[PDB]
Every structure is written in structure tokens, then in C-alpha cells.
């Protein structure tokens, strides 16, 4: 039972542990969110199939690690789904051939938000998978751990919906104009969405976000967001109604708005957070 | 270029030059009998002198003519005679305007009054001079005195 990654790196054999670097393509699906599909990333074969047959099982205690460690979901082992973290041993897969075949595992996550996400930077831990190996010649069995490491920056979805982008820069014209914000949202299944804004605000009505510009900042001016033609204050849920698999624009447009009196010339920057909710 | 201040005006000539005649001149009081000085304040007859002004500015209106010099120690309004052995004592020279009224020696601008003038034309400033008794009896002798005149224009 010898395995290697998609990149061609041999996974060291033994009864200890091994760090296995793989590519993730997370995704929002209906009911569960795909975290990793190891069936395209890890490939295993039997060097001496004519004399011996290997069996590999996924042990209990296999779970997410690092920043994903607080989450739970399912594991799709050899066509069928089991709870994850695993609470019991899995049926075995047989390796009886020199031909490489996928390690048929795929980790999923139970949604806990609406459009939330979690950043996994490359080089860090995703999951700890306990494997047990047995053969058809003796009754020996040994265990080893595969630590699944991401080798690409990724955002694992945490809810039922996803967004066109998680960071969006927009540039206003040089006062007193406006620019439309390109930001759309879709859900794997039809949900009742709504979003609210957040950040530092200048006014009492909490509608105009303060100018945080660092170099040569203007004065008496801040940023204020609008949809259709209405001021959207912070911590005040706008409602998109019902959103399906087809993308829907939040309909936001950035504007200048006045805070203090004398409007000095200079630069204007404002960072605004958007958080999605079910209604 | 986008905005512009434009300044305007004239400098007008409101004064006159003293004519060559009058730059410096003399007044002859001639002989005066001693006996006519009956008490302090007695005065001889008036002797006319004048000051000619030419050329004159087109914006001249009036002048304040004044006379300065060493005043007499017994009357400040009179011009003192030179004190030599030969000179007459007990006297002082009085100076008068065209209407024969006193023009005090060393009088400041406020005390003096204006005299009308024709603009752009030559002007003649008429005056009178005469003696006045500060003491009696008046002692006889030479009469000698100088006095600077001054013009202040309006």
C-alpha cells in the first residue's frame, strides 16, 4: 500500500504520521459544503498484488484540524457518507493492483452561517485522518495518521450561500459623484436572505462611514452607501427576499456624504463590512 | 488676468512760485519825525509793500502769508530793530495785511488767515508796514530789520 499525491510526492509509509499537501476547491452544495475532494489528490496502489492484498480502513477520531477544528460535517468514503468527525470504523477498501487508484475520500462541512467563510492560507492544517491497514496473509494491523495540508490559499464556505467576491475595492469619481458596487450573492438552495453593513460611523444616524484615509485625508466628508435610492445605515438589515442559484446583486452604490463643516481637499477612504443573514 | 484693479487720479498744482522780484526785496520806511510818538502804541503812516506770485497753479485757491523774525522784547507782535549804537530805540516795526490789520510776528498757522487767489494767473499779495512806539520818548537813529516771509497754500 504505497500512495502519492497529485503533484507526484510519495506519501511516506509507516506507523507514525505524514503531512500530505493537497489542492482544495471548496464549494457550497445543498445541505453540506465541500471542503476537500481527496479522490483527485491522493492515489494509492499495491506493489506486490500477486503475493498479497492490502486493506485500508478509516478509523474513528478522524476530524478537522486547525481553524476548521471547531466544525463538523460528513466524510464521503468510497461512495457513501459517514458522520465527521468519525464515530466508528469505516468499511475497508481493497488494494489488489499495481494500478494507482484514488483514495476515495471527500470531506464536507455542516453549514452554520448564511454566507460566512473561513480563510485557509496555504501550508496549514485542514484535517487529521486516522487510517488502519490490514492484509490477507496475516492478522497484523497497524495505524498511521495523514495530516491533510492545504497547498493553496482558500476560503471554505460556512453557510448556504456564497458571494462573487469577499474583498471588493471601488473607486469614486473626484466628488460629488458616485460608483456602483459590483457584488452578487447566490445560494445552493432557495433561502430567505438579508444583509447588514458595519464599520466606523461619524454621524448619530450611523449612515455615513468615517474617512479613514491615511495620506493627505480630506475633511468634513465620509462614505455613504445607497440602493435603488435609499440611505442604508450600519447594523440595519436590508432584505433581498428569496435568493436561489442565480446570482442577485445587493444593489449597492457608494456616495460621498458630508459630516463636519469646512470641506478640506484630500483623499477619502472608507472600509465597510457586509454580513449576510437568513430571515 | 481673471481679475483687475484700475487706479485713477490727478496730481493738481495748488501752489505758486514767488516771482523773481519778490524772492528777496526791501521796504523803505524813509524819514520819520520823532515827536509824533505820543505814548506807547502811536504809529507812523502806512508804507505799502507787496509780494508777487508767478507762475501759479490751476488748482490754487488761497495762501496763508506769515512773517518770522526776532521779535521786539517789549512787544512780540512787532519786528525788533537791530540794537547798535546808531540805531533808534523805543520802536518796533509792525506788519499789516491789505485791510490794514495786524499780522503778528512768528504767528502759527491757526492765528493766520487765508487770502483768496486767482487760479492759473499771477497773483499780487498786498501789505503795509509801519513803526510803533514801545517806549516814550523814542530815541532817534537808524532803522534796520530783516524778516523772512512764509507761504502755506490751500
Amino acid at each position: 500500500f504505497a500512495c502519492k499525491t497529485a503533484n507526484g510526492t510519495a506519501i511516506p509509509i509507516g506507523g507514525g504520521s505524514a503531512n500530505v499537501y493537497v489542492n482544495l476547491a471548496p464549494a457550497v452544495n445543498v445541505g453540506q459544503n465541500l471542503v476537500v475532494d481527496l479522490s483527485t489528490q491522493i492515489f494509492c496502489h499495491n506493489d506486490y498484488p500477486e503475493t498479497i492484498t492490502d486493506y485500508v480502513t478509516l478509523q474513528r477520531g478522524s476530524a478537522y484540524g486547525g481553524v476548521l477544528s471547531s466544525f463538523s460535517g460528513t466524510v464521503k468514503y468510497n461512495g457513501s457518507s459517514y458522520p465527521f468527525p468519525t464515530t466508528s470504523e469505516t468499511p475497508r477498501v481493497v488494494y489488489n493492483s499495481r494500478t494507482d487508484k484514488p483514495w476515495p475520500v471527500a470531506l464536507y462541512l455542516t453549514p452554520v452561517s448564511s454566507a460566512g467563510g473561513v480563510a485557509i492560507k496555504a501550508g496549514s492544517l485542514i484535517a487529521v485522518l486516522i487510517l488502519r491497514q490490514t492484509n490477507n496473509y496475516n492478522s497484523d494491523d497497524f495505524q498511521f495518521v495523514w495530516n491533510i495540508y492545504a497547498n493553496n490559499d482558500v476560503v471554505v464556505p460556512t453557510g448556504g450561500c456564497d458571494v462573487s467576491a469577499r474583498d471588493v475595492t471601488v473607486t469614486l469619481p473626484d466628488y460629488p459623484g458616485s460608483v456602483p458596487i459590483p457584488l452578487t450573492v447566490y445560494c445552493a438552495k432557495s433561502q430567505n436572505l438579508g444583509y447588514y453593513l458595519s464599520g466606523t460611523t461619524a454621524d448619530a444616524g450611523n449612515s455615513i462611514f468615517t474617512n479613514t484615509a491615511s495620506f493627505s485625508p480630506a475633511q468634513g466628508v465620509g462614505v455613504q452607501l445607497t440602493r435603488n435610492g435609499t440611505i442604508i445605515p450600519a447594523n440595519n438589515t436590508v432584505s433581498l427576499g428569496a435568493v436561489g442559484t442565480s446570482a442577485v446583486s445587493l444593489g449597492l452604490t457608494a456616495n460621498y456624504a458630508r459630516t463636519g463643516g469646512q470641506v478640506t481637499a484630500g483623499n477619502v477612504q472608507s472600509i465597510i463590512g457586509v454580513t449576510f443573514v437568513y430571515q | 488676468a481673471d481679475s483687475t484693479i484700475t487706479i485713477r487720479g490727478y496730481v493738481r498744482d495748488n501752489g505758486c512760485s514767488v516771482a523773481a522780484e519778490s524772492t528777496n526785496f526791501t521796504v523803505d520806511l524813509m524819514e520819520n519825525a520823532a515827536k509824533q510818538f505820543n505814548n506807547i502804541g502811536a504809529t507812523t503812516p502806512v508804507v505799502p509793500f507787496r509780494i508777487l506770485l508767478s507762475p501759479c497753479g490751476n488748482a490754487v485757491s488761497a495762501v496763508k502769508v506769515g512773517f518770522t523774525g526776532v521779535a521786539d522784547s517789549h512787544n512780540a507782535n512787532l519786528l525788533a530793530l537791530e540794537n547798535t549804537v546808531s540805531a533808534a530805540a523805543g520802536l518796533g516795526i509792525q506788519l499789516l495785511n491789505e485791510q490794514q490789520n495786524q499780522i503778528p510776528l512768528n504767528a502759527p498757522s491757526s492765528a493766520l488767515s487765508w487770502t483768496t487767489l486767482t487760479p492759473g494767473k499771477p497773483n499780487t499779495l498786498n501789505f503795509y508796514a509801519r513803526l510803533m512806539a514801545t517806549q516814550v520818548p523814542v530815541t532817534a537813529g537808524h532803522i534796520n530789520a530783516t524778516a523772512t516771509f512764509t507761504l502755506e497754500y490751500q
Binding site: - | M30, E31, A33, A34, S86, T139, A140, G141
Partner: protein, 199 residues
């Protein structure tokens, strides 16, 4: 009525002219005024011009005569010279005697650069009491017109003592004792009384 501005005239050498006033105070009179200079001997020698030499005063008027030098420095430089200025008023028109008036005054020609000044000339006069007479001595270069000459209480005659010369008057011994005198200065005024110094 015709009057002159001065009772005498001083002519300093080098002067170009001297003035003498002539005044008629009578509104109704009209005179011919004729003026000229004579020497000490009363002869018109032409050392001085008078201008105008002849004119007509009609009524209350004044006119100033002017005496001009015509000597050309041919006179004594060391002392005064005596001339006589004459102003003759002729009334211009019954068996009448009509009179003309001549006013006649001393004209002293005074050379420049005399040591003694005029004011100090009076006090230099000296006397000589002898016989029934009194000589007056004048060492100055000025003609002294001595007046109010009192030999005690006895008032003697007036005198004109020449420059660098003498002049004698009548004197009664049957008279006062101490001498006092006065002079007529350049402007016609009397100088103060001075004590008669003898010898």
C-alpha cells in the same frame, strides 16, 4: 507851510545818494521848490547834485529830494567837510510884498575809515577860560554843534567847532563858575549834558 525831514544831512563817502524829505502841510498853497548845495563859503561849486533841482508842490504833498556826490574823492579824507543844503519855497500866484522861504541845513561830507566814532566825539570837547572869552577845542574829525553852553548859570552863545580846530565865544567874568554843554548829533537830537573839562 514847507518843512524838511532833517535839520542836517550826513553824506558818507562812497554813498551813491542821500535823501531829504520836503513836505507841504497846507492844502491851499502851491510852491515852486528850488534846491541846491553850496560850500562853506556859500558858493555853488557843483560838488553835489540835487535832483529834482526844481519842481512844483501843489497842496498837501511830500516829495523826496536826492543829493548826489559829484566830488570824485577830491576832499579831505582825514576829517568832515561842511556844505550847505538849501531848499527854497516860492509861493506861486494889490501892492503886496510876497515872501519866499529858504530852509538851510548843514550837509557834512564824512570820509570813510575815521578812527573815532561819532557818538564818542562829544565827550572829547575841551575848553580854555581866559580874558573875557572862552575857546572851544575839538580834536575829533567831526564838526561839533555845541549848544546850551553854560558858564555856571550864565548861558553863553551856541557854537560850531570845526574838526581838528577851535572856536571862541564871548564870556563875562561877572558870571557863573562851572561849565556844562550839549551837542546836536547826526539825527538832530540833543546829546546828554556833559561836564566842561578844561586844559
Amino acid at each position: 507851510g514847507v518843512a524838511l525831514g532833517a535839520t542836517r544831512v550826513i553824506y558818507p563817502a562812497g554813498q551813491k545818494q542821500e535823501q531829504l524829505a520836503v513836505t507841504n502841510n497846507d492844502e491851499n498853497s502851491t510852491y515852486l521848490i528850488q534846491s541846491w548845495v553850496e560850500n562853506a563859503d556859500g558858493v555853488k561849486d557843483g560838488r553835489f547834485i540835487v535832483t529834482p533841482p526844481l519842481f512844483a508842490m501843489k497842496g498837501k504833498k511830500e516829495n523826496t529830494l536826492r543829493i548826489l556826490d559829484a566830488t570824485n574823492n577830491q576832499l579831505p579824507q582825514d576829517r568832515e567837510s561842511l556844505f550847505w543844503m538849501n531848499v527854497k519855497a516860492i509861493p506861486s500866484m494889490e501892492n503886496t510884498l510876497q515872501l519866499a522861504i529858504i530852509s538851510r541845513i548843514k550837509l557834512y561830507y564824512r570820509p570813510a575809515k575815521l578812527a573815532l566814532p561819532p557818538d564818542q566825539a562829544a565827550e572829547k570837547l575841551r575848553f580854555r577860560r581866559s580874558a573875557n572869552s572862552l575857546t572851544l577845542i575839538n580834536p575829533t574829525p567831526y564838526y561839533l554843534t555845541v549848544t546850551e553852553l553854560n558858564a555856571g548859570t550864565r548861558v553863553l552863545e551856541n557854537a560850531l567847532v570845526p574838526p581838528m580846530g577851535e572856536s571862541t565865544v564871548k564870556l563875562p567874568s561877572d558870571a557863573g563858575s562851572n561849565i556844562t554843554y550839549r551837542t546836536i548829533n547826526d539825527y538832530g537830537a540833543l546829546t546828554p549834558k556833559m561836564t566842561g573839562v578844561m586844559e
